[PDB]
Design a protein around this ligand. Sequence first.
Ligand SMILES: [Mg+2]
Ligand code: NA
Ligand code: NA
Length: 326
Amino acid sequence: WMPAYACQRPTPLTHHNTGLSEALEILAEAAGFEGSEGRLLTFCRAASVLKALPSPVTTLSQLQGLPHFGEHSSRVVQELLEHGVCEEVERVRRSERYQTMKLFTQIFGVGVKTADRWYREGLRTLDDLREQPQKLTQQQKAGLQHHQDLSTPVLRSDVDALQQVVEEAVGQALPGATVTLTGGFRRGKLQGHDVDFLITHPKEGQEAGLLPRVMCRLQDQGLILYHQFERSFCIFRLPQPGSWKAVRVDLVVAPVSQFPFALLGWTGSKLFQRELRRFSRKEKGLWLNSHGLFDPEQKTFFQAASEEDIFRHLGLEYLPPEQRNA
DNA sequence: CGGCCTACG
DNA sequence: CGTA
DNA sequence: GCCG
Ligand SMILES: [Mg+2]
Ligand code: NA
Ligand code: NA
């Protein structure tokens, strides 16, 4: 009944099993912290299956036959249903290791391997890192410097303000170039922790060299706190009433021939994308990324005019962005 | 048993 | 490695 | 951890 890949089923933003999915996502995150990307993936997939169900799970019976539910994920749901809490999940939550790895990996520039090294070295707090600045890359120094602002939810009003200044810079850099909001806000989220924009031009090739010109124009308006091509992972100085706040912004340039692939890629969700690329390769024999869809036997790229074209070619029912919240 | 998205900076 |  |  329930399809096995997240790209085969609609997943709305608001769903009926948040308590269960959040618990499984804690186990997925913890699996990542210990270096098991396979267990992370299963727990993420199991959580995503629950987000796609039409009703609350109230009895263990309702898991029977669901993809990515085995002994472990089922036991977690069982305990939550029976007792309101899962002992394993609570143990993880309260553990010094989980809490510190979560604290460190939330920093822009810090992933699991870096965080794990710092944990093994005895570091535990943001202050501890500030005390040892030579342990930090320039990217990490920026992530730590702006950490409080970057932990503040980005709102739609912020997105609209950012879109206007990005459109202004892009128009100054290249007449006719366009700016498309992607990421979580395109999927309908009302908040986020960053903002993603996709930039192109209707005439193939005109966009060459565009992103450095856009960055210079934003920098000269004082809008850039951190950056450093066709992808830029930035921190903007966003004006506020009487002041300013740092906001994470991703800027991406694509040639228009690639625009539907880049739009599909950068719209996410992250799990949706990896499930879609897995489906493409394992079920259809085609290789998908944010540039194209490649048939490795014919050695040809699919010409797509829209996201719908990409879904149809993969034999998938089209999902609008608001249903890609896997 | 081995696979688990696939790129760019 | 980091980012998505 | 789950699945092909
Ligand atoms: Mg982003
Ligand atoms: Na991080
Ligand atoms: Na985003």
